[PDB]
Design a protein around this ligand. Structure first.
Ligand SMILES: *[C@@H]1O[C@H](CO[C@@H]2O[C@@H](C)[C@@H](O)[C@@H](O)[C@@H]2O)[C@@H](O[C@@H]2O[C@H](CO)[C@@H](O[C@@H]3O[C@H](CO[C@H]4O[C@H](CO)[C@@H](O)[C@H](O)[C@@H]4O)[C@@H](O)[C@H](O)[C@@H]3O)[C@H](O)[C@H]2NC(C)=O)[C@H](O)[C@H]1NC(C)=O
Ligand SMILES: *[C@@H]1O[C@H](CO[C@@H]2O[C@@H](C)[C@@H](O)[C@@H](O)[C@@H]2O)[C@@H](O[C@@H]2O[C@H](CO)[C@@H](O[C@@H]3O[C@H](CO[C@H]4O[C@H](CO)[C@@H](O)[C@H](O)[C@@H]4O)[C@@H](O)[C@H](O)[C@@H]3O)[C@H](O)[C@H]2NC(C)=O)[C@H](O)[C@H]1NC(C)=O
Ligand SMILES: *[C@@H]1O[C@H](CO)[C@@H](O[C@@H]2O[C@H](CO)[C@@H](O[C@@H]3O[C@H](CO)[C@@H](O)[C@H](O[C@H]4O[C@H](CO)[C@@H](O)[C@H](O)[C@@H]4O)[C@@H]3O)[C@H](O)[C@H]2NC(C)=O)[C@H](O)[C@H]1NC(C)=O
Ligand SMILES: *[C@@H]1O[C@H](CO)[C@@H](O[C@@H]2O[C@H](CO)[C@@H](O[C@@H]3O[C@H](CO)[C@@H](O)[C@H](O[C@H]4O[C@H](CO)[C@@H](O)[C@H](O)[C@@H]4O)[C@@H]3O)[C@H](O)[C@H]2NC(C)=O)[C@H](O)[C@H]1NC(C)=O
Ligand SMILES: *[C@@H]1O[C@H](CO)[C@@H](O[C@@H]2O[C@H](CO)[C@@H](O[C@@H]3O[C@H](CO)[C@@H](O)[C@H](O[C@H]4O[C@H](CO)[C@@H](O)[C@H](O)[C@@H]4O)[C@@H]3O)[C@H](O)[C@H]2NC(C)=O)[C@H](O)[C@H]1NC(C)=O
Ligand SMILES: *[C@@H]1O[C@H](CO)[C@@H](O[C@@H]2O[C@H](CO)[C@@H](O[C@@H]3O[C@H](CO)[C@@H](O)[C@H](O)[C@@H]3O)[C@H](O)[C@H]2NC(C)=O)[C@H](O)[C@H]1NC(C)=O
Ligand SMILES: *[C@@H]1O[C@H](CO)[C@@H](O[C@@H]2O[C@H](CO)[C@@H](O[C@@H]3O[C@H](CO)[C@@H](O)[C@H](O)[C@@H]3O)[C@H](O)[C@H]2NC(C)=O)[C@H](O)[C@H]1NC(C)=O
Ligand SMILES: *[C@@H]1O[C@H](CO)[C@@H](O[C@@H]2O[C@H](CO)[C@@H](O[C@@H]3O[C@H](CO)[C@@H](O)[C@H](O)[C@@H]3O)[C@H](O)[C@H]2NC(C)=O)[C@H](O)[C@H]1NC(C)=O
Ligand SMILES: *[C@@H]1O[C@H](CO)[C@@H](O[C@@H]2O[C@H](CO)[C@@H](O[C@@H]3O[C@H](CO)[C@@H](O)[C@H](O)[C@@H]3O)[C@H](O)[C@H]2NC(C)=O)[C@H](O)[C@H]1NC(C)=O
Ligand SMILES: *[C@@H]1O[C@H](CO)[C@@H](O[C@@H]2O[C@H](CO)[C@@H](O[C@@H]3O[C@H](CO)[C@@H](O)[C@H](O)[C@@H]3O)[C@H](O)[C@H]2NC(C)=O)[C@H](O)[C@H]1NC(C)=O
Ligand SMILES: *[C@@H]1O[C@H](CO[C@@H]2O[C@@H](C)[C@@H](O)[C@@H](O)[C@@H]2O)[C@@H](O[C@@H]2O[C@H](CO)[C@@H](O)[C@H](O)[C@H]2NC(C)=O)[C@H](O)[C@H]1NC(C)=O
Ligand SMILES: *[C@@H]1O[C@H](CO[C@@H]2O[C@@H](C)[C@@H](O)[C@@H](O)[C@@H]2O)[C@@H](O[C@@H]2O[C@H](CO)[C@@H](O)[C@H](O)[C@H]2NC(C)=O)[C@H](O)[C@H]1NC(C)=O
Ligand code: NAG
Ligand code: NAG
Ligand code: NAG
Ligand code: NAG
Ligand code: NAG
Ligand code: NAG
Ligand code: NAG
Lengths: 166, 185, 166, 185, 185, 166
């Protein structure tokens, strides 16, 4: 089947219907909140590793808050929830790329763009690894440029629709 | 310091997946030969590639272990998933076990086309299980044994960060490539 | 994988490419025909319980009509078709919400908006239950409001593009 | 009577799932303890939570039942799905059966951390199967036995409407959490 | 020659799927009764519907075959997938085998209501595997036996083109409809 | 889960972001290149048999190029990649149509429209078979007209949005 977990409402009011990653979920121990535009894509896309990690973390939080946690683990819970949370085929794809020598995502590191002035961002995409090291930025700069292009096209089209409505 | 289109700064983040410890197992790599899958902050499995065997009998008393019901259920589940994920396993003597007193000890004897051997299937499954960095996808190593024993918590993740991805991905592999051994399963 | 069953053509001509639920399939023993807009969402949405029930009912009717039905049951047929018919992960999500004390769907009851003047409707959404009883309307009125807003925005956009083409 | 945005009147519908009876099984709940799964209009299974056991031996002669081939194939399929869906089942004594003459009677002894017991897995599977009404997802009841017997059709669905959802959902749970009992599956 | 909307000519293509031979099995049909699944350009399986049986014993020594490890691993995997895909198989005597020397010979005795038989289940799995050629979805044929023997590559695909679709589709069917034969799997 | 294999970049520069089928993959032994627009649908659609066969062929080529091919086959590789490459439920749906006497796809033959002047084409759809023969062209001409109308509407909307941007 397909993933189904709905993300819980973001604590931060800056992103009313978005999502916030707290200081504990990140290595740099800061707060990073992503807007409604990026998080809405997570409801329809099937190949965004970041949206699967978001669903995993949100499931973790909800389980910790609504169920009585004990140190002894309920392996069964994750065994039943896994396919409701993530696409295991994404994992298989990254494995196949690994064994074929293509750079692959190991779910640790992600990059995204920031529109300094406004603070709006894009949906983070995985920083691929290859030969035991992270790809150099110059090796995937075309994808970053393409992401910028998408962020432009979509914004102009929304503004046009706005003009249409007024 | 990296500006794209004059207005877009490239920034990065890294998730601390270790924080998932209470709701899913976390696997990490110590070095080439040693890998671990921890369950919570108290227990886990140590997986070792080695020339030093620790079991010198041909028994694996799985039914007696179930009857005695002394082991950790999560660890038995992980062991079951690992074994059911091995493709084309067909030499039962190559796997030996010790479960007395609730302990878990499993030993795969990898000694010997080289592709169609128990060593290859077990090593592919193990590579998938930790995923910490021959013809087609075939794997061969110089180790004679893979030993899986329970262990207590310590900071083991020097080579790779802890991650649940390998286990979760392997969950779907279960029974996908097992042979039939009788007509009535 | 993903569901694939195409809905059969609606008997009622009022909804040319929509779908009609006859008096037998409903408790209120009436005929309810849904338009092209609502049924088109069922081909691409993954979280609409109603579209999974529609696929189940359509499979049932077609099987009853093209195969010689007998009282002894062919569990095999549904066993093979199930994942082609419904997303089992939707079921898993409703189970997880149930065990977490979150209001959940029992696939029994659905609500939708009706534009009296035109007769157009929205895609029915499951009426959630919690603590053994159906939610009071005031508890989820926000979702109904959201549905009205989306049906408005989409209608406006279609009218604009129409204006554009002419 | 409820008007939204001044132009959108709110309306409801409820599906009569009963019409699916010929192409999928329908589960329903009579009360807390009694639940039913009907297959067609002629036969089904009664699931009873009870303190009164009906089997007083330790046998479950599945292979003899298969060879005799007298039982109803659909009911045996459902029973197999139920048993394969139990997580971490490791006490074969907890299950006793009677298939003589083609009937299907299966009884789970639930008497005894309480989470890692046969009672919990059995009760979770039962909750999934009828889906009609402890730490983490753990379930405990005061009942000593779960009894599954064939039955004829009758209007049992007083507490919840018949539905195939539980069975269809459980279809994917099969073998998902079974243990290995031998090296050669 | 066939213009649509004035400016769109309708064109077609047909895929030569035989080129996939090295990475996936290819099935094809010779005639109503004979079907084949080839693996690469060297070996494969011939499936024959026939009244003429080739095995006259009741043995199927799968464990000993695994012990000797002389058969082709891919062919044994395909056999396992086929057998695990049969719905409601409960007559182990209906399947007989010979594996001496690494050969593969499997014979299903289809002789016998006709819907609830081993014949039907075997024939549905075979029908899915080759895509060639009762109440509900039930199938019946006049053949008394289905025989599976290894074979060498030869241009056999006179009635249907080689295709991986049947095998790939059957992969997900594995173990979906098997019965339980004991309490501890 | 859902398929995830990304198509590799097309060798032919005529279709910058499309895909090309070489002479070996087709019976008519010619080269057929499809543009980026048609191939982009393959990333989001779940019921396009042609996009599943494309993923199969692309996996075949990539496996032959990055792995040391040998005559003995690694069935395990395809066993693990299958659900990452194709929707097995599409197959199940075609099986169900077959057993119900409904026309079905046997993945052999595909039809598409060609805009002679420009060379742009549509995404090929499976040529259905029934009662042992391919359907006559007159039996599904309505679907071809539907495809032409949809291609017209989408084209008109792209030029309108162009006009919008300028
Ligand atoms: C479930 O199956 C068991 C076991 O079935 C037996 O074993 C299987 C493998 C097949 O070979 C079956 O044909 C066998 O029956 C059944 O228990 C058996 O029940 C039968 C029928 O009542 C018993 O046979 C009778 O037992 C009496 C004497 O028993 C003594 O001697 C025998 C032989 O030395 C010995 O095994 C037993 O322990 C006693 O010492 C007597 O009435 C009569 O002569 C006949 O032999 C048989 O003994 C039972 N077996 C055991 C191990 O107890 C269950 O009945 C069956 N249950 C259901 C619900 O069908
Ligand atoms: C499939 O496997 C069966 C069973 O194999 C036996 O059981 C397995 C578990 C292993 O232990 C095997 O080593 C066993 O052989 C095979 O049948 C056996 O074939 C062998 C070889 O031909 C037979 O051994 C010979 O049998 C003759 C005498 O048999 C009599 O005495 C024995 C012992 O008391 C008795 O078991 C048998 O019933 C007869 O009363 C004789 O030629 C010679 O001395 C030798 O012992 C063996 O008897 C067979 N077993 C049985 C139970 O019939 C099948 O051949 C094999 N088939 C295939 C296709 O591979
Ligand atoms: C995804 O791939 C990346 C790139 O390969 C990989 O990043 C690597 O992670 C390891 C483990 O964190 C890093 O190794 C660290 O390097 C320094 C120098 O040794 C130290 O900070 C670390 O050692 C200390 O911390 C450990 C963890 O607490 C302790 O176990 C240890 O005793 C020390 O206290 C550690 O060795 C490595 O530098 C990076 N590589 C790069 C290029 O950044 C990442 O782990 C992969 N993720 C997954 C989930 O596979
Ligand atoms: C999902 O959960 C909902 C919410 O709990 C649940 O709705 C409930 O359904 C039951 C069963 O239909 C309703 O109980 C009925 O109520 C009255 C008063 O007793 C009677 O109509 C019914 O009893 C008669 O009919 C039965 C069936 O024919 C006979 O067996 C019986 O002898 C009587 O003749 C029955 O008790 C209950 O009222 C609702 N609850 C609400 C709040 O409406 C729904 O069924 C669940 N869906 C599924 C598919 O499980
Ligand atoms: C999908 O369905 C279609 C339509 O039913 C089906 O097409 C059939 O394919 C077969 C196999 O390719 C065709 O059989 C050919 O027929 C002609 C006429 O006799 C012959 O030229 C062919 O013989 C050649 O090929 C043989 C095998 O390689 C050689 O032994 C021989 O020497 C020749 O070289 C061959 O028999 C058949 O004509 C079509 N039918 C139609 C109506 O087009 C197709 O196979 C199905 N696909 C799948 C994957 O199931
Ligand atoms: C395994 O992961 C869990 C979940 O992330 C960790 O437990 C959590 O640990 C953090 C950090 O110590 C706790 O946050 C702190 O809690 C209190 C207030 O509640 C206070 O000290 C701080 O303000 C901070 O918020 C968090 O509460 C705790 N969660 C639970 C449910 O106990 C755990 O530390 C991880 N284990 C290992 C070995 O890393
Ligand atoms: C792991 O597997 C290896 C390889 O099978 C085991 O070594 C093998 O040990 C057996 C005896 O247990 C040896 O067989 C004997 O060898 C000689 C003749 O070669 C003679 O004593 C007997 O006739 C018998 O055949 C076998 O040669 C040997 N194989 C090797 C060394 O490659 C090993 O014992 C296993 N490890 C464990 C811990 O069980
Ligand atoms: C369901 O399981 C319970 C719990 O195991 C079973 O009750 C148990 O019955 C056995 C005998 O079958 C009792 O063992 C005996 O008890 C006394 C000493 O306590 C003595 O007679 C013997 O030495 C032997 O140990 C056991 O105590 C008892 N456990 C209880 C009551 O908690 C029950 O029989 C099972 N029911 C079915 C239908 O199988
Ligand atoms: C089984 O499928 C494989 C893979 O598609 C086929 O092998 C391929 O066969 C073609 C046609 O002979 C080879 O193309 C030719 O190769 C050389 C240059 O490399 C030259 O003769 C021609 O210009 C042409 O390109 C292709 O290289 C070859 N690939 C490999 C990896 O060997 C094989 O023919 C199929 N077997 C059957 C019985 O259809
Ligand atoms: C394939 O299956 C058929 C049907 O089960 C097998 O034929 C059956 O063969 C047995 C003996 O092996 C026959 O039983 C005997 O029949 C007579 C009385 O009818 C008498 O000699 C004995 O008392 C015993 O009951 C059985 O009738 C017969 N069934 C038929 C012909 O329908 C057949 O042998 C199997 N083929 C292979 C290759 O094993
Ligand atoms: C672990 O030991 C192997 C050798 O194992 C021996 O040979 C086997 C065939 C079998 O008989 C075992 O019981 C024996 O113990 C080491 O493999 C050697 O590796 C080096 C370096 O790669 C290579 O040059 C040698 O040829 C290998 N020897 C053989 C016999 O293949 C392996 O390196 C050891 N691993 C460690 C970590 O010490
Ligand atoms: C069914 O019986 C149980 C008690 O079973 C008894 O105790 C077991 C431990 C074992 O020894 C059995 O053989 C015995 O028959 C009832 O549990 C009681 O429930 C009440 C109400 O919740 C509670 O106050 C008591 O403490 C419980 N007693 C025990 C011993 O746990 C249970 O209620 C019975 N179920 C029904 C529906 O009547
Ligand atoms: C790692 O090695 C492979 C060959 O093993 C090579 O193709 C690749 O370029 C190397 N990685 C990098 C980042 O250069
Ligand atoms: C890997 O780490 C283990 C545990 O410390 C150590 O014993 C072993 O020497 C290491 N192996 C290698 C190959 O460095
Ligand atoms: C693990 O965490 C628990 C709290 O969840 C705490 O009681 C326990 O001491 C921790 N164990 C270790 C070894 O740090
Ligand atoms: C049902 O009961 C639970 C506690 O058992 C309570 O938290 C919940 O709010 C109740 N539901 C409603 C809708 O009031
Ligand atoms: C199918 O072909 C085989 C092999 O030539 C032949 O023996 C058999 O008679 C044919 N079967 C039918 C039903 O035509
Ligand atoms: C079947 O396999 C065996 C073992 O390799 C071989 O000797 C035999 O020739 C094969 N049979 C046929 C008919 O090809
Ligand atoms: C094929 O024959 C069946 C009856 O055998 C018939 O119903 C069907 O219409 C035929 N096929 C076509 C395409 O007409």
């Amino acid at each position: 089947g397909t993933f189904t977990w709905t993300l819980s409402d973001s604590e931060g009011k800056d992103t009313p219907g978005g999502y916030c990653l707290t200081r504990w979920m990140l290595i740099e121990a800061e707060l990073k909140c992503f807007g409604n535009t990026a998080v809405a894509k997570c409801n329809e896309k099937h190949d965004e590793e970041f949206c699967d990690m978001l669903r995993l973390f949100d499931f973790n939080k909800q389980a910790i808050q609504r169920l009585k946690a004990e140190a002894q683990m309920s392996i069964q819970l994750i065994n039943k929830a896994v396919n409701a949370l993530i696409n295991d085929q994404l994992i298989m794809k990254n494995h196949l790329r690994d064994i074929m020598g293509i750079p692959y995502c190991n779910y640790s590191k992600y990059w995204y763009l920031n529109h300094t002035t406004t603070g709006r961002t894009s949906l983070p995409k995985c920083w691929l690894v290859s030969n035991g090291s992270y790809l150099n930025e110059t090796h995937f700069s075309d994808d970053i440029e393409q992401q910028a292009d998408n962020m432009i096209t979509e914004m102009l089209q929304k503004e046009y629709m706005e003009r249409q409505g007024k | 310091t990296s500006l794209y289109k004059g207005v877009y700064e490239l920034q990065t983040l890294e998730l601390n997946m270790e924080t998932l410890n209470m709701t899913m197992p976390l696997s990490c790599t110590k070095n080439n030969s040693h890998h671990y899958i921890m369950v919570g902050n108290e227990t886990g499995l140590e997986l070792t590639l080695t020339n030093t065997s620790i079991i010198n009998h041909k028994f694996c008393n799985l039914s007696d272990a179930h009857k005695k019901n002394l082991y950790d259920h999560a660890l038995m589940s992980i062991i079951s998933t690992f074994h059911l994920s091995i493709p084309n396993f067909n030499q039962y003597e190559a796997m030996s076990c010790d479960f007395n007193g609730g302990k878990i000890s499993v030993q795969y004897n990898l000694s010997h086309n080289h592709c169609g051997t128990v060593a290859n299937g077990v090593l592919q499954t193990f590579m998938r299980m930790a995923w910490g960095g021959g013809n087609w996808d075939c794997i061969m190593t110089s180790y004679q044994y893979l030993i899986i024993q329970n262990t207590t918590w310590e900071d083991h993740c020097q080579f790779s960060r802890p991650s649940p991805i390998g286990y979760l991905g392997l969950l779907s592999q279960r029974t996908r490539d097992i042979y039939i051994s009788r007509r009535l399963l």
